[PDB]
Design a protein around this motif. Structure first.
Motif, mmCIF file in Angstrom:
data_model
loop_
_atom_site.group_PDB
_atom_site.id
_atom_site.type_symbol
_atom_site.label_atom_id
_atom_site.label_comp_id
_atom_site.label_asym_id
_atom_site.label_seq_id
_atom_site.Cartn_x
_atom_site.Cartn_y
_atom_site.Cartn_z
ATOM 1 N N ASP A 169 29.707 -10.933 -13.600
ATOM 2 C CA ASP A 169 30.904 -11.813 -13.515
ATOM 3 C C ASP A 169 30.623 -13.207 -14.114
ATOM 4 O O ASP A 169 31.444 -13.726 -14.880
ATOM 5 C CB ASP A 169 31.392 -11.928 -12.075
ATOM 6 N N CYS A 217 31.132 -19.210 -7.659
ATOM 7 C CA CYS A 217 31.337 -17.777 -7.683
ATOM 8 C C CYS A 217 32.143 -17.285 -6.453
ATOM 9 O O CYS A 217 33.044 -16.431 -6.616
ATOM 10 C CB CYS A 217 30.009 -17.027 -7.841
ATOM 11 N N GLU A 218 31.865 -17.832 -5.252
ATOM 12 C CA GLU A 218 32.688 -17.523 -4.085
ATOM 13 C C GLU A 218 34.135 -17.973 -4.256
ATOM 14 O O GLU A 218 35.053 -17.252 -3.836
ATOM 15 C CB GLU A 218 32.108 -18.151 -2.807
ATOM 16 N N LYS A 276 35.887 -17.972 -6.879
ATOM 17 C CA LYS A 276 36.526 -17.003 -7.774
ATOM 18 C C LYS A 276 36.487 -15.552 -7.252
ATOM 19 O O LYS A 276 36.964 -14.628 -7.936
ATOM 20 C CB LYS A 276 35.969 -17.113 -9.198
ATOM 21 N N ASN A 277 35.931 -15.351 -6.063
ATOM 22 C CA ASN A 277 35.751 -14.008 -5.469
ATOM 23 C C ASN A 277 34.913 -13.063 -6.369
ATOM 24 O O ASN A 277 35.123 -11.845 -6.423
ATOM 25 C CB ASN A 277 37.118 -13.352 -5.082
ATOM 26 N N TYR A 278 33.930 -13.645 -7.076
ATOM 27 C CA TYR A 278 33.002 -12.866 -7.921
ATOM 28 C C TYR A 278 31.853 -12.225 -7.121
ATOM 29 O O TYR A 278 31.442 -12.750 -6.091
ATOM 30 C CB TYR A 278 32.406 -13.765 -9.022
ATOM 31 N N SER A 279 31.375 -11.090 -7.637
ATOM 32 C CA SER A 279 30.315 -10.305 -6.963
ATOM 33 C C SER A 279 28.934 -10.377 -7.609
ATOM 34 O O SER A 279 27.947 -10.221 -6.883
ATOM 35 C CB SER A 279 30.735 -8.859 -6.788
ATOM 36 N N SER A 280 28.856 -10.613 -8.935
ATOM 37 C CA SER A 280 27.566 -10.596 -9.630
ATOM 38 C C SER A 280 27.326 -11.828 -10.496
ATOM 39 O O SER A 280 28.222 -12.322 -11.172
ATOM 40 C CB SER A 280 27.482 -9.335 -10.505
ATOM 41 N N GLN A 330 30.047 -13.973 0.928
ATOM 42 C CA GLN A 330 31.150 -13.074 1.275
ATOM 43 C C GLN A 330 31.453 -12.154 0.100
ATOM 44 O O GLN A 330 31.333 -10.926 0.233
ATOM 45 C CB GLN A 330 32.376 -13.868 1.755
ATOM 46 N N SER A 331 31.876 -12.729 -1.038
ATOM 47 C CA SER A 331 32.091 -11.954 -2.261
ATOM 48 C C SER A 331 30.785 -11.701 -3.045
ATOM 49 O O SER A 331 30.658 -10.618 -3.655
ATOM 50 C CB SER A 331 33.134 -12.629 -3.157
ATOM 51 N N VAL A 332 29.835 -12.655 -3.053
ATOM 52 C CA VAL A 332 28.601 -12.523 -3.889
ATOM 53 C C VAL A 332 27.680 -11.450 -3.268
ATOM 54 O O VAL A 332 27.312 -11.543 -2.090
ATOM 55 C CB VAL A 332 27.878 -13.862 -4.054
ATOM 56 N N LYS A 333 27.376 -10.427 -4.077
ATOM 57 C CA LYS A 333 26.512 -9.287 -3.674
ATOM 58 C C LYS A 333 25.240 -9.090 -4.466
ATOM 59 O O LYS A 333 24.320 -8.439 -3.968
ATOM 60 C CB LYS A 333 27.315 -7.942 -3.709
#
Ligand SMILES: COCC(=O)Nc1ccc(O)cc1
Ligand SMILES: [Cl-]
Ligand SMILES: [Cl-]
Length: 182
Positions: free
Chosen positions: A36, A112-113, A115-119, A155-158
């Motif tokens: 992302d 990144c959070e 924008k609700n991004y994960s990677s 939360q969103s970041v994985k």
């Protein structure tokens, strides 16, 4: 309170959990990654074209270069967010290689959070033109992730992956992961 076990899921890739986030390191060319967000380590003018920054600005293209200089001339920025251009990402976040690395990585995670991004994929920020020492950079990057998890902010970041140009710098990151492991 947060660290899992270091393993190798693919040849040359090392990973461990930090809370809910998978943290990975590998050597290679960051401009071939998909995520992302891709992070660029640049100068306080956002127009360095040497080392990782050269590879990133050449592959991203001239519209991204113009986005950088336009924002640079609008206010005093600690970092800037642009489009991905021809990189395989949704946004590039351009951080200043000479700045405090823990601060820079904290800002990337927060953006990144929002924008609700994960990677996320990043280089070994500051080890090129800025000439920061590789174990201080590794310590700072991993410290920023630990603090973000400790505060309950993930939360969103994985997934957070460091793609590193020099294999010798990868070895320093791997030693730092082993120091921390559960
Ligand atoms: C940010 O500091 C590390 C750096 O510049 N690395 C680097 C990446 C690609 C390349 O082709 C040459 C060097
Ligand atoms: Cl740098
Ligand atoms: Cl690097």
């Amino acid at each position: 309170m947060f660290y899992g076990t270091v393993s190798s899921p693919d040849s040359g890739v090392y990973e461990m959990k930090i809370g809910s986030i998978i943290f990975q390191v590998a050597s290679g060319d960051i401009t071939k990654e998909e995520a992302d967000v891709i992070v660029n380590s640049t100068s306080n003018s956002f127009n360095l074209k040497a080392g990782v920054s050269k590879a990133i600005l050449e592959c991203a293209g001239q519209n991204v270069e113009r986005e950088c200089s336009q924002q640079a001339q609008q206010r005093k920025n600690d970092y800037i967010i642009t489009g991905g251009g021809f990189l395989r990402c949704k946004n590039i976040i351009h951080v200043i290689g000479g700045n405090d690395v823990k601060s820079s990585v904290s800002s990337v995670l927060q953006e990144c959070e929002k924008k609700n991004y994960s990677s996320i994929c990043l280089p070994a920020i500051g080890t090129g033109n800025a000439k920061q020492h590789p174990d201080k950079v590794a310590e700072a990057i991993i410290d920023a992730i630990e603090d973000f998890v400790q505060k309950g902010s993930a939360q969103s970041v994985k997934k957070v992956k460091v793609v590193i140009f020099l294999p010798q710098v990868l070895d320093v990151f791997y030693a730092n992961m082993k120091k921390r492991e559960g």
